Amino acid sequence: SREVIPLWEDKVADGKAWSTHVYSALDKLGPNLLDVIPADRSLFCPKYSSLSYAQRKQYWAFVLSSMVRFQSNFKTAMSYTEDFNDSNGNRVISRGLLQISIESGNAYGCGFKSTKDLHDPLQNLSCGIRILDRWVSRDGRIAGKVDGAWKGGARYWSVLRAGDKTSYKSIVSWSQNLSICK
């Protein structure tokens, strides 16, 4: 009786298993995320404050799938060499569905043992829950720039940072037009 279905279920063979993992991992890794009433709800989900717990898990699984859509187009094997360095002076390699890197990701407690673990879709999605759980809850908002500093998920993901990008405008549009949000 879900009202909102994540985009990875449309094409990905394991898409339903990904959703089941996210719904369960949200209980364990996103309890702070799911207690926030975000200050930019008027932008992302106008009716956020009336969502049940189950609807908020449906919402965050959808938003994660919309980020995956533009980060990796659902390709868990994807890697991308960035413009900047890790602390050792090697260019950062972003990996997997949400394009997380091992050094910055492991700072969230994601516990990646090796780079191969970032291409494990379940570990990758769990890490993205951890990142959101930290910053959406600390900043009290999903994204946006407040007094010259990016907030919420935009702290980590440039795909959530406002601008004239198809990715950002689509994530915003898809979120705010979910039946449970509008």
Residue numbers in the entry: 0 to 181
Passage from the reporting paper:
Here, we discover a family of Bdellovibrio proteins that define a new subgrouping of the lysozyme superfamily and demonstrate that they possess outright specificity for deacetylated peptidoglycan. We solve the structure of family member Bd0314 (that we named DslA), revealing adaptations to the lysozyme fold that sterically restrict the active-site cleft into only accepting polymers deacetylated at the GlcNAc positions. We determine a role for DslA in B. bacteriovorus exit from the prey cell and demonstrate that exogenously added enzyme is able to prematurely liberate predators from prey bdelloplasts before completion of the predatory lifecycle. The architecture of DslA is related to, but significantly different from, other members of the lysozyme superfamily but still fulfil the inclusion criteria for the lysozyme superfamily noted by Monzingo et al. — conservation of the β-sheet floor and helices D and F, with appropriate placement of acidic catalytic residues.
Using the DslA structure as a guide, we next monitored the activity of DslA mutants for the putative active-site residues. Variants E143Q and E154Q clearly fold and retain a similar active-site architecture (as judged by our high-resolution structures herein), but display no notable activity (middle), confirming their participation in catalysis. The lysozyme superfamily has a conserved ES motif at the C terminus of a central α-helix, which is readily identifiable as E143/S144 on DslA helix D. Residue E143 of the conserved ES motif would act as a general acid, protonating the equatorial linkage between MurNAc and GlcN, with E154 acting as a general base to activate water to attack the MurNAc C1 in an axial orientation. The structural equivalence of DslA E154 to the β1 secondary catalytic acid residues of goose-type lysozymes (also GH23, but with a second catalytic residue lacking in the lytic transglycosylases), v-type lysozymes and chitosanases, and our assay on the E143Q and E154Q mutants argues for an inverting hydrolytic mechanism for DslA. All four of our DslA structures (two wild-type, E143Q, E154Q) are highly similar, other than a relatively small flexation of the β1–2 hairpin in the E154Q variant. Additional controls were performed using EDTA plus DslA with one of the catalytic site residues inactivated (E143Q), or using conventional hen egg-white lysozyme (HEWL) or buffer only. The percentage of prematurely released, external predator cells increased significantly when early bdelloplasts were treated by exogenous addition of DslA, whereas no significant change was detected for the treatment controls DslA E143Q, HEWL or buffer only.
